Amino acid sequence: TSEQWLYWLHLYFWPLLRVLALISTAPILSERAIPKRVKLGLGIMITLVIAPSLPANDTPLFSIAALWLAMQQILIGIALGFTMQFAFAAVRTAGEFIGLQMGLSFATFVDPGSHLNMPVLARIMDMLAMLLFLTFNGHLWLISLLVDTFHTLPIGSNPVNSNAFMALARAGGLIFLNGLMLALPVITLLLTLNLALGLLNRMAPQLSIFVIGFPLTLTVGIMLMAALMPLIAPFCEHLFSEIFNLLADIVSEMPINN
């Protein structure tokens, strides 16, 4: 219990720091609903299971010259959790743009301090994707990849290489790509509807989409997205797997590149 331990209690601190970074940044782990004590205790109580079989020996220098080590762990956590947010942003884009088609957002068109559309359709699909994530192996693969980072990039004087934050920067990237690739059928069908009801204006310029168009397009959008709700379930697979691969890639890109 002395420093014969209490500097071997320096075995817990760095892995705890990395696990805590991931928890504070991860998609499900870092939700404001969880009491802060639960997240902290989960970090401590994961590292206690992972800390043995982690041969770590460093020093919390006074006026830390090894804070650049602490940085390292924090950064790796930011790598793992935050990137997994891209998969949600995608749908939080897709569904949002779907509203931007029907009628829901003409307040956001010509000008304000109130957006009012984030509550409407983006939070439908984003929490639907929340559940799709969790239902696997959602909560867990992030933690397993964190342990894998412990084993591939444990603790070192060369923590992070350049040319490797572009990977995450131009990664999304696939935020726009996948948001589209999901919302494309709905957008295309409502484009057809909008152009058709516009062509009605050729027979009579009085038909006034404000009067005719919006009630039609709202029903079309609601019914159609009801019909194309299940299409998300396969897409989320993609939407997570590829991003995992990216993380996996960078996690396994870093050791052979160091």
Binding site: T1, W5, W8, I23, S24, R37, K39, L40, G41, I44
Partner: protein, 75 residues
């Protein structure tokens, strides 16, 4: 094999308890009238046991302070 520092704390507590129990049984035996045991030996062992017990109390205080501090980092 493994250290499992909760096991180390258990070992420390067992050491403290065993030392106090030994001092107590020595005082037992001496006041009972058992020949052998001397008075200065009794008092010296009681003194050492008291010091070890305050050792344990101080370790308790600082461990509780440390835990109450690690539960304050915001996450």
């Amino acid at each position: 094999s493994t250290v499992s520092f909760a096991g180390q704390l258990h070992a420390a507590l067992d050491r403290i308890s065993d030392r106090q129990a030994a001092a107590r049984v020595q005082a037992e035996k001496f006041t009972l009238g058992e020949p052998g045991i001397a008075l200065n030996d009794v008092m010296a062992d009681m003194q050492k046991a008291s010091v070890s017990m305050q050792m344990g109390i101080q370790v308790r205080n600082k461990l509780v302070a440390a835990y109450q501090e690690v539960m304050s980092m915001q996450v």
